[PDB]
Amino acid sequence: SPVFQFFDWVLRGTSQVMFVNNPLSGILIILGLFIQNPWWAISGCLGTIMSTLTALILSQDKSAIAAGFHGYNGVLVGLLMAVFSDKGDYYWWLLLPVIIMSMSCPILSSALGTIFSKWDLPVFTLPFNITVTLYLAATGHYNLFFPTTLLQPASAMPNITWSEVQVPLLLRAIPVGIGQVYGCDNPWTGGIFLIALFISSPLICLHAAIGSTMGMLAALTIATPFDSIYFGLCGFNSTLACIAIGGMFYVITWQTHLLAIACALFAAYLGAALANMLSVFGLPPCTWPFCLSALTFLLLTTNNPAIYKLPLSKVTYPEANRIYYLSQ
Amino acid sequence: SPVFQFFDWVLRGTSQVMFVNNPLSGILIILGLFIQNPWWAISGCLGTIMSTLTALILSQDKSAIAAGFHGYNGVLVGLLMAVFSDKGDYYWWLLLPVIIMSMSCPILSSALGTIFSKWDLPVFTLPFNITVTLYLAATGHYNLFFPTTLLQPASAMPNITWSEVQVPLLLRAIPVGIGQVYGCDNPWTGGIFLIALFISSPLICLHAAIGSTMGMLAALTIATPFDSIYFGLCGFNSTLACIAIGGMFYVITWQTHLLAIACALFAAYLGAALANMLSVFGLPPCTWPFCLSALTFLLLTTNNPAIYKLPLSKVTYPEANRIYYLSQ
Amino acid sequence: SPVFQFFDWVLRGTSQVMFVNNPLSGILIILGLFIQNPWWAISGCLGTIMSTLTALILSQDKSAIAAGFHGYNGVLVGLLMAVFSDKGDYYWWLLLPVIIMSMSCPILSSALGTIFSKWDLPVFTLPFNITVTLYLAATGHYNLFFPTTLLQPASAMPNITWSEVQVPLLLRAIPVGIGQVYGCDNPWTGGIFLIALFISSPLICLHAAIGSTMGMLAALTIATPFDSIYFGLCGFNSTLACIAIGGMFYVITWQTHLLAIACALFAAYLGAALANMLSVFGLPPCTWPFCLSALTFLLLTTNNPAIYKLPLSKVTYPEANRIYYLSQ
Ligand SMILES: CC(=O)c1ccc(C(=O)Nc2cccc(NS(=O)(=O)c3ccccc3)c2)o1
Ligand SMILES: CC(=O)c1ccc(C(=O)Nc2cccc(NS(=O)(=O)c3ccccc3)c2)o1
Ligand SMILES: CC(=O)c1ccc(C(=O)Nc2cccc(NS(=O)(=O)c3ccccc3)c2)o1
Ligand SMILES: CC(=O)c1ccc(C(=O)Nc2cccc(NS(=O)(=O)c3ccccc3)c2)o1
Ligand SMILES: CC(=O)c1ccc(C(=O)Nc2cccc(NS(=O)(=O)c3ccccc3)c2)o1
Ligand SMILES: CC(=O)c1ccc(C(=O)Nc2cccc(NS(=O)(=O)c3ccccc3)c2)o1
């Protein structure tokens, strides 16, 4: 029956946000989202369903849809449209734009696909960034139908007293950091996401934890206010970069491990920079630093024989990549 | 005599703004411009003449100049320099910068030509955008020689009463929308431009009207203030995108018709977004959304056999493209 | 002994800022920097040393390192980090970020190298611009550890009285203009830099002087305040563009001479534009106009046989390029 295949496709698309291709992980992710806020989960599921349907209508490649590559952008756009909303919970009209902008994810992810194929690179999360920035800038806070929350550039020297830092929450910032990938801020959903990652491949989970820790440490060297670190907004760009560079697109080796740690640090600093720059327009920084940093560390060329870049036709998950590299 | 050939070249360059290659259409366009404001027409004609002469001096391709591809950027830069001016009518010194910046149109349109040729794409209007943004940002409002008018970001929630909407002007917004391509705002010049388009090819005229209507409708779903819609600033980016995607660069078919309508809607929303974003610097959004949207819908690849993309060496006008596709 | 070779490498890297490859020129540059401000020289030397060491560790091409192509970005990032600092002279903690960001110069200059090689173009100064913009935006003025100085957009109509212009300083603006390439503002260091350039190749020195004069003249046509022209900030982007286009990457001929002068003028106007635009974020414009203008005048294609573009594998310095072109 086609319907079961379709729902398998949407589950895989939901799972594919953190480079994991497994329906059980998708079920766990949906359970975590419903633990967080039901309205956000509804918006995300609607977004991914509509994105997959539009991709099917435009008749792109069959294997790509069957693997879920076309569904991991709808869930993010739905969740981030439901988060930055001033109307509150259960504002049904918000479901109208979610249908429209989701349709723009299959198109853009195809267009960039023609440009990046020359250098054999992936289209990481650029369509989601473009669509969400477009919508948030088009609506604005002073809108009569879909108002947005306020972001404003800093105006005075922050007040920090180092005698009040609390180690408990500083350590706690890791699960919240890994949970903030989907926009959630509860420790429980962070733990559930960690379990869902670990079910499929341990290496991804370990690298996500290391990246979150790197992001949290990197923000204490420029005197970031403690509230941002506690909330976890300073460590959700590092995890994705660390996962992408560490084991997936490079064959795993200790040199690539160090390179991934460097990627996490660079992503964190670029994230701070873009967060301060984009605050003038009133827009938030969302997965721009990860895209730029991951793209700039996959174009580097070295003569060291241990840093091997896999072709895009074979990347499945780190252990399989290792065995494939060793076999031939 | 060379002089007659030269004036034929400038007339074709003037006509080429709306993808039409015919001297009679150019005469009609000039008549409309002189109906609007004589000073603006003088500036535009000077710009196109200087741009064509510079292109001839740099010795680019002969056929391109003879077809007018090098003259459709000077007229726009001249008109938009004459529009955003605070000194008033008949400020002769303004003719000095117009000579200089026009010379920068043949250069840029060549440079981008080397980059885009890899993927076989056109350089739609990027040189005009780059030059005008450069000039407007360099001068600024607080200038002692060439001051500019004021644009400022919104600061308070707009006041809209839906009981005062007037259907007459809302319907009227279509001819003004098609006339705003050259910067004019009079219904009479809009009608004249429509006639000039219809003389050469009916399909272009029909698609321009449909695109203008789409742009006008798309702005009522985000509560745009009525003055902008009445003035026609919300429907001059959609017409160009609809014309470009509908019949010119794709073989005409109902699938491409729907794709062109989608292009118009996407261009309108991106136009709103860029208009709100660029207001911080004090610059207006001018033909950026059309360029980006048209470029992002010519790189899409599909397996449907009815969406055929013509090579750039054969695009003449939609009926000829249809007959050429059917013949072989 | 390897150590002597290493110090030769860092000297060549220091010299390679103005397209000159000679240790004696490097010694002269260091002498000028130490004449200006010892702290700035310390920061620059540390930056170039760390950049060269990182490039060696990443194991890039051997000839490129031996020629100094990897050391001309560290000195600039060190100098510009030492200039825009509010803490004052001898703030030792500033040496910590200088070590980190310098390590990001070998990486980026490699990544862009894979993209630009398709069209056979160089990576002029983009890594330095990216790194410095990232750091300055990330820290900001309202920072608790590394505060920056303040740049603010203009708010009122400037006051200029043409009866007070002083020809002495207007003529003086040329050596200061050529000296502001490294961030110094003293006439003596400008003269020393001019001598250092002249020792290796007269053509580079002459073109630098012509470019500085062009930049100084171009700023009096838009009523720039006199303080900026006196300080020399209006003529350090033109010199680099004139040197790059005039003799290095094109075979020297009078047509290319005129083209280089045009490049200087275009770079100056784009510099004014970017300076006014980037002031909203609080960042300064640093070698962006030179990069963009030089890149856009190396992609132009003409049928004139006298405008010949050399391959990147043979560019050494203008006289050698001339003799090589004539020989075959
Ligand atoms: C969230 C995130 O960062 C992420 C998850 C998966 C990916 C990804 O990029 N996978 C992938 C794997 C192999 C090949 C390609 N090729 S592609 O050009 O990007 C392409 C995109 C669309 C449809 C067809 C192909 C993509 O990014
Ligand atoms: C993966 C992705 O794209 C994503 C999901 C969620 C986010 C995100 O949350 N971005 C962000 C970054 C900075 C500030 C804000 N919001 S804030 O009002 O300024 C604020 C700052 C401090 C503490 C409370 C709230 C949001 O990004
Ligand atoms: C206003 C507008 O959007 C418009 C009108 C005409 C065009 C256009 O793009 N025509 C065209 C038709 C076929 C081939 C190319 N090739 S090109 O690279 O763009 C190129 C530009 C310069 C001189 C030589 C060639 C261009 O855009
Ligand atoms: C084809 C092209 O490039 C072009 C020609 C003319 C325009 C144009 O008009 N852009 C634009 C867009 C938004 C606002 C303004 N001007 S305004 O002062 O803010 C204002 C807004 C509302 C009603 C009155 C005036 C101008 O673009
Ligand atoms: C000071 C300044 O503006 C400047 C910029 C570039 C040069 C220069 O001399 N570039 C050059 C000369 C020959 C070959 C290449 N090739 S490259 O791909 O860009 C490449 C960059 C990195 C390391 C290896 C090679 C670059 O001077
Ligand atoms: C090669 C390079 O990267 C470089 C070296 C030096 C600079 C540079 O100096 N840029 C710059 C440009 C504009 C303004 C400012 N600073 S300012 O505070 O606004 C100011 C304005 C008026 C008089 C004094 C100082 C700095 O760039």
Method: cryo-EM
Same fold, B2-139 and B202-327: yes
CATH ID of A2-139, from 1.10.3470.10, 1.10.10.60, 1.10.3430.10, 3.30.565.10: 1.10.3430.10
Residue of B110, B140, B280 with shortest CB distance to C300:
B110
Check A300 against C60: CB less than 8 A apart: no
Contacts of C134 in chain A (CB under 8 A): 269-270, 273
Neighbours of C264 (CB within 10 A): 29
- Structural contact between residues C146 and C139, judged by C-beta atoms closer than 8 angstroms: yes
Residue position matching structure tokens 């001059």: B236
**Secondary structure letter of residue A81 according to DSSP:** H
- Structural contact between residues C212 and C239, judged by C-beta atoms closer than 8 angstroms: yes
Closest alpha carbon to B280 in B118, B101, B106, B154: B154
Q: Which residues touch A28 (CB under 8 Å, ≥6 apart)? A: A192, A193, A195, A196, A199
**Secondary structure letter of residue B84 according to DSSP:** S
Protein fold of C173-327? Ammonium transporter fold (1.10.3430)
Tell me the C-alpha to C-alpha distance, in Å, between residue C91 and each of B134, C25, C142, C147, C235: 39, 29, 18, 12, 30
Per CATH, the homologous superfamily of domain A166-327 is Ammonium transporter AmtB like domains (1.10.3430.10)
**Secondary structure letter of residue B310 according to DSSP:** P
Neighbours of C195 (CB within 10 A): 13
Contacts of A115 in chain B (CB under 8 A): 119, 299
Q: Nearest CA of chain B to the CA of C271: how many Å?
A: 8
What are residue C250's DSSP bridge partners?
C309
Residue of B114, B139, B144 with shortest CB distance to C119:
B114
> How large is the C-alpha radius of gyration of chain A?
19
| One-letter identity of residue A36 | Q
**Secondary structure letter of residue B123 according to DSSP:** -
- Structural contact between residues A85 and A79, judged by C-beta atoms closer than 8 angstroms: no
Check B111 against C297: CB less than 8 A apart: yes
- What does C58-104 look like in DSSP terms, one character per residue? HT--HHHHHHTTTTTTHHHHHHHHHHS-SS-S--GGGHHHHHHHHHH
Residue position matching structure tokens 């160009």: B240
Contacts of C113 in chain A (CB under 8 A): 301
- What does A125-189 look like in DSSP terms, one character per residue? SHHHHHHHHHHHHHH-SS-SSS---------S-----GGG--HHHHHHHHHHHHHGGGT---HHH
Closest alpha carbon to C169 in C120, C229, C219: C229
Three-state DSSP class for residue C144 = coil
| One-letter identity of residue B36 | Q
**A280, closest residue in chain B (CA to CA):** B280
CA distance A18 to B27: 60
Check B138 against C222: CB less than 8 A apart: yes
Mutate to test the pocket of ligand 2, among A73, A182, A239, A286 (most ligand atoms within 8 A of CB): A286
Hey, where are the domains in chain C?
2-139, 173-327
Query: Is CATH 3.40.50.2300 the classification given to domain B202-327?
Result: no
Interface test with C, best of A159, A266, A281, A300 (most C CBs within 10 A): A300
Check C138 against A273: CB less than 8 A apart: yes
Resolution in A: 3.0
Q: Which residues line ligand 3 (CB under 6 A)?
A: B 16-17, 19, 64, 69, 72, 109, 113, 116, 122-125, 312, 315
Which bound ligand lies closest to the C-alpha atom of A233? 2
CA distance A242 to A198: 16
> How large is the C-alpha radius of gyration of chain B?
19
Q: Which residues touch B242 (CB under 8 Å, ≥6 apart)? A: B207, B208, B210, B211, B214, B260, B261, B263, B264
CA distance B33 to B189: 7
Check B107 against C296: CB less than 8 A apart: yes
Give the Å distance between the CA of B286 and the centre of ligand 4: 8
**Which chain B residues have any C-beta within 8 angstroms of a chain C C-beta?**
58-60, 104, 107-108, 110-115, 118, 133-135, 137-140, 142-146, 280-281
Neighbours of A195 (CB within 10 A): 13
CA distance A180 to A123: 21
Check C222 against B118: CB less than 8 A apart: no
